[PDB]
């Protein structure tokens, strides 16, 4: 019988091109088949870093910590290194600019008990929030693999997570990254100072391709490689032109 998961090591060329190493995992929804350049790493667990703003957003919305995507979270007045963080934000722009202090406030409002209960209900990674309530996704005990990111994202796409359909629709709106006549990308980046992530999906007219990639990332100088390498794989597989 056909294989649910297939390894394609030719994608390693896209990583070694940049003296890098990592994994891309693709899932073809229509075919119910997955593809990766590294089966082992596809299933190894890493800190989610800023990809955690997907579940964090869902929980904050479902609990009413965030009322809607227009509610303004005012800048606290502390000038931070990332200039786009030094202003007021809403859910859309806080996702787009990956505004850590806004999401730390969400996590504090959610609190440990409800955060843990929600991650258990989401079957999210190892479901472990050990560490600080407002930083465990960057320096605490939670871990998730690329294949587990895909599992979670497929549930979100199909409105199957254990939060309201409304919360799921709002977060999918906030994940919008790129759209044109050929495809729509909904995704989220992350970086934990050692590993970079890009997770999300590509919507086509008659199919959707889920993706989760992580790569060794010793400095922020190479962060654009997260999208660049993933797009080289998508182009090789004829998913985008």
Ligand X SMILES: *C(=O)N1C[C@H](NOS(=O)(=O)O)CC[C@H]1C(=O)NOCCN
Give the residue numbers of the binding site for Mg(2+).
86
Query: Binding residue for ligand X (CB under 6 A) from 22, 34, 190, 200?
Result: 190
168 is an interface residue for ligand X by CB under 6 A: no
Three-state SS string across the chain, please? Answer: CCCCEEECHHHHHHHHCCCCCEEEEEEECCCCEEEECCHHHHCCEECCHHHHHHHHHHHHHHHCCCCCCCCCECCCCCCCCCHHHCCCECHHHHHHCCCHHHHHHHHHHHCHHHHHHHHHHHCCCCCCCCCCCCCHHHHCCCCEEHHHHHHHHHHHHCCCCCCCHHHHHHHHHHCEEEECCCCEEEEEEEECCCEEEEEEEEECCCCEEEEEEEEECCCHHHCCHHHHHHHHHHHHCCCCC
Q: Which residues are annotated binding-site positions for Zn(2+)?
A: 17-18, 162, 232
Q: Which does 96 bind (CB under 5 to 8 A by kind): ligand X, Cl ion, its own copies, none?
A: its own copies
Which 95-124 positions form the footprint of its own copies (CB under 8 A)?
A: 96
Which 183-222 positions form the footprint of its own copies (CB under 8 A)?
A: 184, 203, 205-206
Nearer to its own copies, 99 or 213 (CB): 99
Scanning 155-163, 164-172, 188-196, 201-209 for contacts with ligand X by CB under 6 A, the matching segment is 188-196
Query: Binding residue for Cl ion (CB under 5 A) from 130, 173, 207, 236?
Result: 173
Nearest to 203 by CA among 232, 188, 181: 181
Look up residue 163 and give its two tokens.
């939060």
Active-site option among 50, 57, 145, 151: 50
Scanning 31-39, 115-123, 139-147, 176-184 for contacts with its own copies by CB under 8 A, the matching segment is 176-184
Nearest to 151 by CA among 7, 232, 32: 32
Nearer to Cl ion, 21 or 207 (CB): 207
Is 135 an active-site residue?
no
189 is an interface residue for ligand X by CB under 6 A: yes
Which residues participate in catalysis according to the annotation? 50
Give the interface with Cl ion as residue ranges (CB under 5 A): 173, 176
Give the interface with its own copies as residue ranges (CB under 8 A): 92-93, 96, 165-166, 169-170, 173, 176-181, 184, 203, 205-206
Give the interface with ligand X as residue ranges (CB under 6 A): 49-50, 98, 100, 138, 189-191, 193, 223
């Amino acid at each position: 019988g056909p294989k649910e998961w297939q390894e394609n090591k030719s994608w390693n060329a896209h990583f070694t091109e940049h003296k890098s190493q990592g994994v891309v995992v693709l899932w073809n929804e229509n075919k119910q088949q997955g593809f990766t350049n590294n089966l082992k790493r596809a299933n190894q667990a890493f800190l989610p870093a800023s990809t955690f703003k997907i579940p964090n957003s869902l929980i904050a919305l479902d609990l009413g910590v965030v009322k809607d995507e227009h509610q303004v979270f005012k800048w606290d007045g502390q000038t931070r290194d990332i200039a786009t963080w030094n202003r007021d934000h809403n859910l859309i722009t806080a996702m787009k600019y990956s505004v850590v202090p806004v999401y730390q406030e969400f996590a504090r409002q959610i609190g440990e008990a409800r955060m843990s209960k929600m991650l258990h209900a989401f079957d999210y990674g190892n479901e472990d929030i050990s560490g600080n309530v407002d930083s465990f996704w960057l320096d605490g005990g939670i871990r998730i693999s690329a294949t587990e990111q895909i599992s979670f994202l497929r549930k979100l796409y199909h409105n199957k997570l254990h939060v309201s359909e409304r919360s799921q629709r709002i977060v999918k709106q906030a994940m919008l990254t790129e759209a044109n006549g050929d495809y729509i990308i909904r995704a989220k980046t992350g970086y934990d100072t050692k590993i970079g992530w890009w997770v999300g999906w590509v919507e086509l007219d008659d199919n959707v391709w889920f993706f989760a990639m992580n790569m060794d990332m010793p400095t922020s100088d190479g962060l654009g490689l997260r999208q660049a390498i993933t797009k080289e794989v998508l182009k090789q597989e004829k998913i985008i032109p």
